[PDB]
């Protein structure tokens, strides 16, 4: 109204409120369908006579929990014969934590005599999620993708792993080692079927209490992500794209500078979408937030669903700030 | 250089809005059955019409073109029907398909479907009728809300689009009657909201060679009279749109405006500004803001799993094609 700049501010304020509404609606569907806790009135019957998935520490079978003429599908996690538990408290933590997009949740336990005809004997915990493949099983096929196609797919799975780890670092606990065979992949709920899978962390036997320490401390997982990132990158076909060049520099920075999981997510999101080192940043983020909303509207016109990558992108752009992008760029060009 | 970024953003959302309109229009006009050939096979679906219009009984028929699946409907002449202007029926076969016109795909003579309830050779329409406008009004005006005039104004904009196509042609309809108009669901972009309107009454459409304005819209004084009848059937005039329709009916009979001027003023009541907007100076940033808000609303609906309605496609047609001179006419005709 007689001030083009006030109109520009009102448009940024409303499209950002819409961007948070878009994120919250997609998150509510993406995290929907969670089964309630197990009760004495629930009848448990087996689906899989052989493992539906295998991790490094356990075998997984589906079980149907029937009640009130309906049911939920839960997974029984059966530890492999000879498997150890370096940190038993991490299993007590798994049963104490609320649901998280990238962590394996529990809905209860099947005690002895409650599930007839099982492949195993003894009380078993019930996981809320249903597995499809391990990260190692995905790599066995995925390493045949074109250079940039494979590397992008891995870079987005790494962003999910950093978030799962950020929760744990803010919580006050850490993994002693990273093992892709205990990282499981499933299709995301309510998202396009051709996008990236949802990443679940299951290795709670390796999670231990680790106090955050002083404000100048190193990130407890940084040298594990640096070495793992280089081993995963050595599986990609060669490319000259900035994406692969930034991921190799970030691996050197993870072992050299030792950033936290929240600083790691910032630089990785900045490499995936962010500006170059030349920035100043406000106008860029305001244009990119508006462009994702236009792409979502243009594809909706064709009856196309958003993918998990678009929910993760809209999450970065909605949470991105000038101070956060300053830190993200600083690691990238240093 | 923020001024350079704001110019680039307006151009980037404009090509996206035109792409959204073209993709939703392509879904709405998708599957149009092709012309009838010796390769087509037909089967009867019913013994009673899917729509009963003033001068036609509409029966649904299956067609297959080399095993390509199509549904078409026979326009069986209703007993007592006539043709005051036979040229208008030649015009219906002549013109290209249009979203709000009743299209034809060819003739099916008697004997193709031995079990048919009709006799004689009957042409088959591309669209599949569900009800007439008079049939919708009988129930729809029984328990209207005060905002009911919203559903009527949107069907009126569609009828004005069908009449604008004929007015751009060499043609006019001499007698306008809601009992001869048809409503169907939109294809590919379907919701429970307003139906697609089809203009059917070509038996009464005559030649219109005049150049000078004369009466600019031969259909306007007829729409003004029908709109006053519709406003007395609807809920009390408590919504600004009902008051806008009351003065619009007086203007339709007083000024006899063309369908293109009726669509401008009617779109201004539906989505555009009133006299609160000289006033027209605000239209530049008003279209840029309203165009961006519709793109944002479509993305927020998609985030919730809600498809766009035919109203949202008509809204994006109005906003993508509206200009400062078109909105200047729209507002000047209303006030």
Author numbering:
A (entry chain A): 128 to 406, 419 to 473
B (entry chain B): 130 to 406, 415 to 472
The authors write:
PEAK pseudokinases are molecular scaffolds which dimerize to regulate cell migration, morphology, and proliferation, as well as cancer progression. The pseudopodium-enriched atypical kinase (PEAK) family of pseudokinases, also known as New Kinase Family 3 (NKF3), is composed of three members: PEAK1 (also known as Sugen kinase [SgK] 269), PEAK2 (also known as Pragmin or SgK223), and PEAK3 (also known as chromosome 19 Open Reading Frame 35 [C19orf35]). Crystal structures of truncated PEAK1 and PEAK2 lacking the unstructured N-terminal domains revealed that these pseudokinase domain-flanking helices fold into an “XL”-shaped helical bundle and facilitate dimerization by forming an “XX”-shaped high-affinity dimerization interface termed the Split HElical Dimerization (SHED) domain.
The addition of detergent to combat the orientation bias required us to work in a higher protein concentration regime, which shifted the particle equilibrium toward the complex, limiting the number of PEAK3-only particles. Nevertheless, the available PEAK3-only particles were initially processed in CryoSPARC and then re-extracted and imported to RELION for 3D classification and refinement to further alleviate streaking artifacts common for samples with preferred orientation. This yielded a low-resolution (4.9 Å) reconstruction of the PEAK3 homodimer. The limited resolution could be due to the low number of particles in the resulting reconstruction, especially impactful for a protein of this small size (108,034 Da). Globally, however, comparison of the PEAK3/14-3-3 structure with the low-resolution structure of the PEAK3 homodimer alone did not reveal major differences within the PEAK3 dimer, with an overall average RMSD of 0.623 Å. These differences are thus independent from 14-3-3 binding and intrinsic to PEAK3.
